[PDB]
Write a protein that binds this ligand. Sequence first.
Ligand code: NEA
Length: 393
Amino acid sequence: VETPPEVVDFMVSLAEAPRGGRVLEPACAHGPFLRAFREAHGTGYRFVGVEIDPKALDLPPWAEGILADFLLWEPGEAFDLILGNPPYGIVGEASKYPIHVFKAVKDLYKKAFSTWKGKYNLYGAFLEKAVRLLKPGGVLVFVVPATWLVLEDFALLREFLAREGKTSVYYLGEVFPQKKVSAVVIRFQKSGKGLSLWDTQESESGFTPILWAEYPHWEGEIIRFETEETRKLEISGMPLGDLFHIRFAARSPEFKKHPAVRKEPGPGLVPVLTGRNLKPGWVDYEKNHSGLWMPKERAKELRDFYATPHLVVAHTKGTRVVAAWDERAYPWREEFHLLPKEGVRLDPSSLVQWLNSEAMQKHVRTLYRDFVPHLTLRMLERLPVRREYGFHT
DNA sequence: GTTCGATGTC
DNA sequence: GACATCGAAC
Ligand SMILES: NCCSC[C@H]1O[C@@H](n2cnc3c(N)ncnc32)[C@H](O)[C@@H]1O
């Protein structure tokens, strides 16, 4: 894992520190950020690097190297500037997640971080740790995944940043070669308040920040790339979430242990559908992509709504809206399942067409770009639906 | 119940 | 690029 030169340069161009100030690079290894900052701003600073793997710690003699777990590190003094690229990843069982540590250690992280939510991520913890290590007025500059702009797992982190100081977010995108992640650079200052969202332009000369929008009273709300168009479209109709209760499919384990489910096709048996069975406007009821089969009528045992024809919206087809009406009412292993709320009148055919329209695809693409490889509930809830498609009585 | 991916694999 | 994880985690 290395950070592209132009990314480091761009980040260094956003960093600031007072003469003789303390500068730190967490999870430094050989310290690419300390080197770049020193070459750009001089040597009149106290350079510190923290690395947990001794084989990786390799700093120049003018910097102070510290062997320790950054997240549980307790220095004597706070810092004026913290910059770097923290490790990303969920802490969990190796068969499913990338970060592997003793449960007791994960317990220590949970105890130390007030923003730790759900499965959380190593990068969220590094952000909180760095902010806590920041001296009043101090500045932090990290490059991390863009997922924290919209995901629930990071609601406390956003709320934390909003109340601890001022934040600027610069969208980069997939700037890490052979690394499947959409990234953003965050410049946080432990003072003031508000949020500034910037887009960037890449050139040979490097990255150039382009001011997109400003939210002076940001309190941790989901961060999006709004435009006059997205705004105009959102107030043109009722949020989809006000018309439908939104549930998710029962998970693979539930099906796998259910006595009515089989690993092979058979009479009276039907496949448990997945995102691969959902297409724009229709459902492929024949193909089996889950390796699971079961009698249709028994599906209501895992989720009661599996017995009722209803609207289905995709979750993992990237940032877009793919919907279809499940007229047969099949058992599903994935996707969103929307049940109309009491008094809600709708036109399935027309609503489906609206959800799959090009206009809708552009709407979500503009707002959430490629932060995450999904259409999340938070995104789905806010989709605007006008009277032509759904009406609340 | 439902969330998230320095995604997993073609 | 196509096309979506899928189950451990809370
Ligand atoms: N800055 C480069 C991206 S992160 C990878 C580096 O982070 C170091 N690292 C991972 N977890 C760490 C932790 N908890 N504390 C300090 N360094 C860490 C790794 O050893 C590796 O050198």
